[PDB]
Amino acid sequence: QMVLAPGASIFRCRQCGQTISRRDWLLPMGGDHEHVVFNPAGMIFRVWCFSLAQGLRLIGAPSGEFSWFKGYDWTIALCGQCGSHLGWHYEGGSQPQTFFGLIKDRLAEGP
Ligand SMILES: O=C1CC[C@H](n2c3ccccc3c3ccccc32)C(=O)N1
Numbered sequence: 001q002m003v004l005a006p007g008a009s010i011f012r013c014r015q016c017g018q019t020i021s022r023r024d025w026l027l028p029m030g031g032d033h034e035h036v037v038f039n040p041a042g043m044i045f046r047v048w049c050f051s052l053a054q055g056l057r058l059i060g061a062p063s064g065e066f067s068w069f070k071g072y073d074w075t076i077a078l079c080g081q082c083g084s085h086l087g088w089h090y091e092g093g094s095q096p097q098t099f100f101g102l103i104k105d106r107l108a109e110g111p
């Protein structure tokens with residue numbers, strides 16, 4: 001027997017294994033799921049956009065300050081299990097209304 005199922009379709013927190021998202025939810029915001037972005041202190045992040053995610057904990061009220069995505073406010077997204085910073089939740093825009101910009105290098109891909 002073999003298991004017949006995708007090998008790299010689920011994204012989990014690299015630190016604790018919490019289920020976070022799926023390859024099926026990758027979202028090409030501005031024509032690419034991948035964005036290389038800088039914050040006000042010059043830190044460069046590599047963000048992957050997903051339409052849906054789970055297992056996160058969103059901290060604080062939304063902010064538009066230095067938002068990387070036009071029309072969206074952001075909230076910090078932690079791993080709800082281990083508290084690792086996994087990226088940001090975006091809300092208040094359109095097509096879609098909400099989505100997640102996740103730090104790709106803090107996720108592990110698997111079956
Ligand atoms: O869309 C976004 C998400 C937040 C991000 N970002 C940081 C990301 C990491 C650490 C600090 C900050 C920070 C502080 C003030 C305003 C935005 C900030 C940013 O630039 N844009």
Ligand SMILES: [Zn+2]
Pocket residue numbers: 013014015016017018079080081082083084
């Ligand atoms: Zn975690």
